[PDB]
Amino acid sequence: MASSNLIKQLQERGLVAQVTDEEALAERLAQGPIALVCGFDPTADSLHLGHLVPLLCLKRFQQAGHKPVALVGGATGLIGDPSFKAAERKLNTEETVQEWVDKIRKQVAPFLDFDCGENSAIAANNYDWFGNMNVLTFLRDIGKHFSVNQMINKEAVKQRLNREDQGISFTEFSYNLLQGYDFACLNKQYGVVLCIGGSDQWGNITSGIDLTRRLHQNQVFGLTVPLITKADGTKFGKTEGGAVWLDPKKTSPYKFYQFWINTADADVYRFLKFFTFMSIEEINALEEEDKNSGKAPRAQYVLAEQVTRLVHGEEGLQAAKR
Amino acid sequence: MASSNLIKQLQERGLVAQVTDEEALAERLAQGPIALVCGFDPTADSLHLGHLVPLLCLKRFQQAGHKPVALVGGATGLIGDPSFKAAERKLNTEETVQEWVDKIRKQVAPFLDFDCGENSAIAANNYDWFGNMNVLTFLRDIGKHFSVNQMINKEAVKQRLNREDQGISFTEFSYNLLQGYDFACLNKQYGVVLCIGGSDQWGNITSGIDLTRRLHQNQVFGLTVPLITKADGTKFGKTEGGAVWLDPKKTSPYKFYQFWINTADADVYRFLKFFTFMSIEEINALEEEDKNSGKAPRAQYVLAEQVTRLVHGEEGLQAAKR
Ligand SMILES: [N-]=[N+]=Nc1cc(C[C@H](N)C(=O)O)ccc1O
Ligand SMILES: [N-]=[N+]=Nc1cc(C[C@H](N)C(=O)O)ccc1O
């Protein structure tokens, strides 16, 4: 009945929006290292700042000794996740998505350790199991476990089905089943018992938990990180020029460092908790220090330095000063 | 602008429940012979009396010079049509359905002419195009043309989604898309421009009409035959022993003839119109004759003789008397 303090620690950083059976999860985490997964869809040839918190959270779990499975949606990216989206996602071609998958897999790799013993990271691609799956097999073997009555009640698609100015394609309506099966598949092959995801993923994650129970009779868990907000109410990671990419060829390390330096005083201490590995004690002391220094706050350049090194390494940090 | 009288003729037999753009259809029918389709799902190793009106209606179209496509649902029978059904259909195995498909195809054949020139019948099986279709291709290429908002409003599935004592699987919810694509596929390969079906098929047929427009920009049509009713309110074709099969090994020709002899006076003249090729004039004269004869009505054994010969031929009619 031992209990891990990992979920508590993430909670103090404000990184847990929702979590299933927290008490039970904390006990399972105390049993020993577990395999967990976080997934990313190839919506572009690179991830951007909107995907960084979940990615770093996967790394936070590995640091605590757990094994991270970095899933790239080679199949789901050909369908489109409608969760809390106002309109249909653009449909990209098979050829282009397969190319983007490889780019994202490569971009994700440096963030995790693939050479640290049994909790070494593992890359996954759901195109492996959906790429050649026949439609009748999908509809029968996976589809019979989903109730449409329940599906149309999921909060993630509620507005699309209720607002006269919106609608949802059968294509995107089926997405929840694909991600649900992803959890069951990874549970069966890698022993994955936890899926963490973005703030708009609760329903997709819970469908995976239920399907894993229905298919393999195993209890698994889910956790979502929060929607990252800015005090001024604007969208985090959105600039006049668009997204802030993690690919240095799209958004240079210099520009990336500039983005963080510009962080609002109201957001900077919360952002240090979400985006860096500094301890809560050190961040709290830094906030107190800035409060009584009479100098410009140090928090913005500490944040810029920390995240720039995490994303672009020492080379990018050096490039940010020339 | 010539107009065919075929739809009018079927209407006088009481065989048209619903029909799309009747005026336009009648004009198209006057242009020349068309290819049309009627489909049957392998729910059992034989069809039964509930499937006979649509089957004979396909033959009525061939007699008027049109070309009948007899479709057997090798794929749709692995999914299950939920239209106006109270509960999920039983899921049968791939191996068993494939066997039943062959049996039904063989049972249907004798009802149509496969050797009468250009309007010769053609057998089709939707397993040809769905059997190996990948799920992502289905969801994207067919799925993007369906609105879930519209799908949940179809009368055929309304009760399943609205009544607390019912529910529908994603499996059966997807059926409408399969049958919809069937129409588009047959339109493209065989020039099929009309689909006729059972009384519970309006929505499945209209989805095919809309998808054929969206995919191939061709205007096609649909028609349904009526739910066959009995004056006493009980279900037609239902007996204490179950269904009345068209397979003589399941329901003997003798038993089949007995079923028709037992027809209620209130139903017999309507049944002669639905189930035989006797002219309306002859049936009307027979009703008048029975009205003023002072003898037992001749209608029941005329009906029994006509339908028994149609279903089991001269051999079965002879067997019905020994
Ligand atoms: N498991 N898991 N997580 C997944 C996560 C994603 C991406 C997720 N739908 C997102 O848009 O964040 C795709 C597939 C997955 O299986
Ligand atoms: N086209 N057409 N008609 C079809 C008709 C059926 C059978 C129909 N759903 C029924 O249950 O009567 C199956 C597939 C079809 O494509």
UniProtKB/Swiss-Prot annotation, chains A, B:
GO terms for cellular component: cytosol; membrane. It is found in: Cytoplasm. The modification N6-acetyllysine is found at residue 144. Utilization for in vivo protein biosynthesis of mutants that charge azatyrosine efficiently to tRNA may lead to efficient production of azatyrosine-containing alloproteins, which have immense potential in biotechnology and medicine. Magnesium is essential for activity. Inhibited by chloride and sulfate in the presence of 1 mM free Mg(2+). When the Mg(2+) concentration increases to 10 mM there is almost no chloride inhibition any more. Inhibited by diphosphate and AMP. Chloride strengthens the diphosphate inhibition and weakens the AMP inhibition. Chloride weakens the binding of Mg(2+) to the RNA and thereby the interaction between the enzyme and the RNA. Acetylation at certain lysine residues could significantly impair activity. D-tyrosine is a competitive inhibitor of L-tyrosine for the formation of tyrosyl-tRNA(Tyr). A motif ('KMSKS' region) lies at residues 235-239. It catalyses: tRNA(Tyr) + L-tyrosine + ATP = L-tyrosyl-tRNA(Tyr) + AMP + diphosphate + H(+); D-tyrosine + tRNA(Tyr) + ATP = D-tyrosyl-tRNA(Tyr) + AMP + diphosphate + H(+). The keyword Ligase applies. The record marks 231, 235, 238 as: Cross-linked with tRNA by periodate oxidation. GO terms for biological process: tRNA aminoacylation; tyrosyl-tRNA aminoacylation. L-tyrosine binds at residues 37, 175, 179. It comes from the Bacteria. Its EC number is 6.1.1.1. GO terms for molecular function: ATP binding; protein homodimerization activity; RNA binding; tyrosine-tRNA ligase activity. It is an enzyme of class 6 (ligase). Keywords: Acetylation, Aminoacyl-tRNA synthetase, ATP-binding, Cytoplasm, Ligase, Nucleotide-binding, Protein biosynthesis, RNA-binding. ATP binds at residue 238. A motif ('HIGH' region) lies at residues 42-51. Acetylated at Lys-144. Acetylation at Lys-144 leads to slightly decreased activity. Acetylation at Lys-85, Lys-235 or Lys-238 causes dramatic decrease in activity. Belongs to the class-I aminoacyl-tRNA synthetase family. TyrS type 1 subfamily. Catalyzes the attachment of L-tyrosine to tRNA(Tyr) in a two-step reaction: tyrosine is first activated by ATP to form Tyr-AMP and then transferred to the acceptor end of tRNA(Tyr). Can also mischarge tRNA(Tyr) with D-tyrosine, leading to the formation of D-tyrosyl-tRNA(Tyr), which can be hydrolyzed by the D-aminoacyl-tRNA deacylase. In vitro, can also use the non-natural amino acid azatyrosine. Homodimer. Binds one molecule of tRNA(Tyr) per homodimer. This is Tyrosine--tRNA ligase. It comes from Escherichia coli (strain K12). The gene is tyrS. The chain holds residues 1 to 322 of 424 of the full protein.
